[PDB]
């Protein structure tokens, strides 16, 4: 018994090529390059799915530092004024968003002054 | 039993296909290692081989075959530890052919052997009887005739 099987190979390569669309040049045409680029893209996806929560926290810190620097104290002093006194688990983003709807944030920053 | 669905209990085991990729394991190297003599086609040198070092068989001295060129003369043997389970009296070739232990087309001499005590009397007609086997058979108030 002889088995040729050109169906399965083409279907597999078609899936790999379909994965990489919107790629420059031949990367979406030739399969040999498409597989390399899909592998590399998924590596980058795995690394960035961690780097982005590494970075968004930093952005929230930055936009909280800026808001507090216009009241007379720094972010590195505000965190004490949440943990030790008036123990609060308000998150590190929402205290950021509260500036985009301000004058409810000022209530926070003057509440810890007690 | 419905050939349309015929099933066993368990016989279909992991078939190690050696060269069909990595996901199954056993892939490109195929279990042959990396780049040795065994890796190449037809590795696995001569069965007894220590690679130049004089092998165990060559190192050891040879057993002597005293009765050279002959074959040991076989015996048909009647042990007493089992012959009790066989139910028969007047043991001989003429009945051992019937009880299928011996064969009719066998001109072979008969020996008796074994220490185990036996209850009922049996009359043996054999070519050799041990000292204590003969003693055991006679303590059962049987007899043994030693054919010449």
């Amino acid at each position: 018994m002889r088995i040729k099987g050109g169906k399965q190979t083409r279907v597999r390569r078609k899936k790999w090529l379909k994965q990489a669309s919107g790629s420059f040049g031949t990367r979406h045409a030739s399969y040999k390059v498409a597989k390399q680029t899909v592998i590399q893209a998924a590596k980058y996806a795995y690394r960035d799915r961690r780097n982005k929560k590494r970075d968004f926290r930093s952005l929230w810190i930055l936009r909280l530092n800026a808001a507090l620097r216009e009241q007379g104290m720094t972010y590195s002093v505000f965190i004490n004024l949440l943990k030790k006194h008036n123990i609060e688990i308000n998150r590190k983003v929402l205290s950021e968003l509260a500036i985009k709807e301000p004058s409810k944030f000022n209530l926070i920053v003057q509440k810890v002054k007690s | 039993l419905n050939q349309l669905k015929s099933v066993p209990k368990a016989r279909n085991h992991k078939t190690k296909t050696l060269g069909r990729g990595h996901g199954s394991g056993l892939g490109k190297t195929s279990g042959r290692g990396q780049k040795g003599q065994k890796a190449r086609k037809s590795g696995l040198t001569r069965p007894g081989f220590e690679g130049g070092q004089t092998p165990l068989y060559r190192r050891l001295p040879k057993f002597g075959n005293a009765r050279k060129g002959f074959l040991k003369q076989e015996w048909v043997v009647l042990n007493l530890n089992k012959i009790a389970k066989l139910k028969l009296d007047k043991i001989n070739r003429a009945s051992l052919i019937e009880k299928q232990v011996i064969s009719a087309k066998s001109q072979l001499p008969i020996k008796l052997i074994g220490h185990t005590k036996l209850e009922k009397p049996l009359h043996f007609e054999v070519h050799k009887v041990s000292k204590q086997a003969l003693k055991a058979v006679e303590n059962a108030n049987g007899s043994v005739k030693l054919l010449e």
Binding site: - | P47, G48, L56, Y57, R58, R59, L60, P61, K62, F63, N65
Partner: protein, 59 residues
């Protein structure tokens, strides 16, 4: 699968495995060895379990 001829003449096989063998250093030089060594080596002995695999399939 033919039995290795130069083996079946050196390893008599007993009941329940336990390949049997003679000892070396008994053919050539008497004086260089001692009496204790000579009468220890006359008695035959078994094969180390390391070589048991190499020999069992060699018979």
């Amino acid at each position: 699968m033919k039995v290795k001829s130069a083996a079946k003449k050196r390893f008599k096989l007993t009941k329940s495995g336990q390949i049997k063998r003679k000892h070396a250093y008994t053919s050539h030089l008497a004086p260089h060895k001692t009496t204790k060594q000579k009468r220890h080596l006359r008695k035959q002995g078994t094969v180390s379990a390391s070589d048991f695999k190499r020999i069992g399939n060699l018979i």
